[PDB]
Amino acid sequence: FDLNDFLEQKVLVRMEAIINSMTMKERAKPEIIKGSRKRRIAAGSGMQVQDVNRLLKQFDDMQRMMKKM
RNA sequence: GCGGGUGUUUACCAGGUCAGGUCCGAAAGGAAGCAGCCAAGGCACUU
Separation of A37 CA and B45 C1' (Å): 34
Distance CA A49, CA A63 (A): 21
The contacts found for A29-32 with CB under 8 angstroms, 24 or more apart, are A29/A2, A30/A2, A30/A3, A30/A56, A30/A59, A30/A60
Q: Which nucleotide is nearest to A47 (CA to C1')?
A: B22
Give chain A's domains with CATH numbers: 1-68 (1.10.260.30)
What gap in Å lies between CA A49 and CA A41, rounded to an integer?
A: 8
d(CA A62, CA A55): 10
- Widest distance between CA atoms in chain A: 36
Q: Among all strands, which nt has the closest C1' to A18 (CA)?
A: B21
Nucleotides on chain B that have an atom closer than 7 A to a protein CB are 11-12, 19-23, 32-36
